């Protein structure tokens, strides 16, 4: 049987977009293993916005359903709390559902000073999803760090993660463009986990920060503070880059780290990001699995059968 660390599965980028999925419920029902959401924390006023582009209100397929009977009924363009409500409603209506990873790009990083930092992020997810989350506290157990835990014992079996949501955080594109040196999402959230762990409060955490940007060796060497490094057990980078010869991807599989490969369609020879043939997409997923991906992501909403695919990771 596979574990969350020994399988390869498929994700949909920007799954909150109405053009892909009329309602977020449709994204949840797609069978995809990974659904990506773009969040903004530094817009004015309350709420985490959900939007591809600079937000004006929100632009999303989330409806803030109160229960499953309300799915596919309400006005959309709801915020992050709205998406989380859809998830809870859908969750309750699908006992034992496949585990789903919500990949969160914090477009503009966190906004601690405005009440939208790591702690508030966790608190909101706890409020909306409660026991349905498998977070760093769950993986880490009695171990000193997430890294120690995952290397020694790996992830639970996929069967055991039935009915669970997981969260991945990456830094955002706007964040990468800041002329100043405000801490990025990755270091900020990893530091939050480190501080929680030191305080004996890792249980209240809700998300795994990822190292974003494919790189050779141990990508966590990019962080000057070695104390932050063992809180990163997820890595997220360009598929073609991972396959270009410069990176030993077996390293991730050996250590049971999750490896998300983005723009899976751009691996040569390129295939369509949205409407490839089923055969093309499946071959691509198998290729990336052999290359030790945990997830292959693209825009393949027209191919739910492919989105549902789960195969052995590596060999
Ligand atoms: Cl594992």
Automatic annotation (TrEMBL):
Choose any GO biological process term that the UniProt entry carries and state it.
Answer: lipid metabolic process
Identify the keywords attached in UniProt to this record, alphabetized.
Answer: Hydrolase, Signal
Instruction: Tell me its EC number(s), please.
Output: 3.1.4.11
Q: Which SUPFAM superfamilies match?
A: PLC-like phosphodiesterases
Give the molecular function GO annotations: phosphatidylinositol-4,5-bisphosphate phospholipase C activity
Q: Which domain of life is it from?
A: Bacteria
Task: Note whether DNA-binding occurs among the keywords.
Answer: no
UniProt xrefs under InterPro entries: PI-PLC-C1 (IPR032075), PLC-like_Pdiesterase_TIM-brl (IPR017946)
Question: Which is a Pfam family this sequence falls into?
Answer: PI-PLC-C1
Which segments does the entry list as coiled coil?
none
Q: List the disulfide bonds.
A: 62-83
**Record's protein name:** Phosphatidylinositol-specific phospholipase C1
Organism name: Streptomyces antibioticus
User: Lineage of the source organism?
Assistant: Bacteria, Bacillati, Actinomycetota, Actinomycetes, Kitasatosporales
């Amino acid at each position: 049987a596979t574990t969350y660390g020994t399988s390869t599965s498929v994700g949909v980028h920007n799954a909150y977009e109405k053009e892909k999925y009329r309602y977020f419920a449709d994204a949840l029902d797609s069978g995809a293993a990974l659904l990506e959401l773009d969040l903004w924390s530094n817009a004015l006023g309350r709420s985490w916005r959900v939007s591809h582009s600079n937000p004006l209100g929100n632009n999303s397929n989330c409806e803030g359903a109160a229960n499953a009977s309300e799915l596919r009924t309400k006005s959309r363009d709801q915020d992050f709390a709205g998406c989380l409500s859809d998830m809870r409603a859908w969750h309750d209506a699908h006992p034992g559902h496949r585990p789903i990873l919500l990949k969160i790009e914090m477009k503009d990083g966190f906004n601690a000073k405005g009440g939208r930092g790591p702690a508030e992020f966790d608190a909101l997810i706890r409020q909306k999803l409660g026991d349905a989350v498998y977070g760093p506290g769950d993986l880490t157990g009695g171990h000193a760090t997430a890294d120690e835990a995952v290397r020694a014992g790996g992830w639970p079996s996929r069967a055991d993660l039935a009915g669970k949501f997981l969260f991945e955080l990456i830094p955002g594109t706007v964040e990468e463009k800041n002329p100043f040196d405000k801490l990025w999402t990755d270091v900020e959230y990893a530091g939050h986990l480190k501080d929680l762990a030191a305080q004996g409060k890792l249980a209240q955490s809700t998300a795994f920060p990822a190292v974003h940007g494919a790189a050779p060796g141990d990508p966590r060497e990019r962080y000057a503070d070695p104390a932050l490094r063992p809180w990163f057990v997820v890595f997220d980078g360009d598929a073609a880059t991972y396959l270009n010869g410069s990176i030993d991807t077996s390293w991730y599989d050996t250590r049971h780290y999750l490896l998300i490969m983005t723009d899976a369609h751009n691996v040569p020879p390129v295939i369509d990001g949205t409407h490839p043939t089923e055969a093309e997409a499946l071959a691509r997923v198998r290729q990336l699995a052999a290359a030790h991906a945990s997830f292959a992501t693209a825009d393949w909403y027209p191919l739910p059968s492919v989105l549902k695919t789960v195969v052995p990771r590596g060999a």
